[PDB]
């Protein structure tokens, strides 16, 4: 128990999902077919863990900022943790809203130890399905610091594309939910995310009539500032 986050709270916590599917024409970005499947899957798989999940669809940049700022201003005293899942287009360091781009760091900053007191010493988890660049992976034949207690689970490594199958959803979300459903009530979060890394790496490969984007691979990227083990027990 000394090496694990205390989970003896009334609620596991809030899980906010920002599901951006449709974008203003001025952004030049296309519809994210498959993302509703991700949002539906995540609602189910995170609820199974014990989270109180709320979904917001097609948010403007101002709305994303307002949502997360307001969430950070709620009283989390009776919650063990907080989670946020961002589903959108992205480039390095930013995520698209319906009307533009917002730096990811500015969205997460609301939950810093000096800004969200009732989440102090509790895990703050961010899962991000978005591109981080335009590189393809061709594959190869087989007091406390204010930034403590954050974990970022990125769908892909910095500088790389992130993949989504239109009738199935993003590879990262598919893998994430399947592992959480199978093992989420048993394994530690890093054990879970490591299995997600392997699943994305091994069970997916891109299909396209466009040669440039055919037979490509993906590996996710977990950034942890956690100070204890996290079990959803």
């Amino acid at each position: 128990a000394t090496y694990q986050y205390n989970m003896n709270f009334e609620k596991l916590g809030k899980c906010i999902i920002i599901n951006n599917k449709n974008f203003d024409k001025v952004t030049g970005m296309g519809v994210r077919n498959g993302t509703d499947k991700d949002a539906e899957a995540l609602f189910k798989c995170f609820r199974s863990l014990g989270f109180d999940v709320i979904v917001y669809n097609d948010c403007s940049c101002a709305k994303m900022q307002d949502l997360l700022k307001k969430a950070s201003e709620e009283d989390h005293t009776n919650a063990a943790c907080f989670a946020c899942i961002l589903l959108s287009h992205g480039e390095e360091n930013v995520i698209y809203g319906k009307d533009g781009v917002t730096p990811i760091k500015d969205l997460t900053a609301h939950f810093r130890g000096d800004r969200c007191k009732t989440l102090l010493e509790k895990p703050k988890l961010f899962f991000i399905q978005a591109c981080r660049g335009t590189e393809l992976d061709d594959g190869i034949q087989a007091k406390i610091p204010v930034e403590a207690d954050f974990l970022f689970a990125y769908s892909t490594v910095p500088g790389y594309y992130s993949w989504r199958s239109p009738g199935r959803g993003s590879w990262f979300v598919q893998a994430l939910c399947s592992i959480l459903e199978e093992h989420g009530k048993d394994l530690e979060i890093m054990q879970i995310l490591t299995r997600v890394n392997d699943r994305v790496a091994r069970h997916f490969e891109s299909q396209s009539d466009d040669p440039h984007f055919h037979e490509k691979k993906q590996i996710p990227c977990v950034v942890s500032m956690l100070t204890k083990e996290l079990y959803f027990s």
């Binding site: 591109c131 594309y161 993949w163 396209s208």
Partner: peptide, 4 residues
Amino acid sequence: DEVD
């Protein structure tokens, strides 16, 4: 498949 598509990219984000």
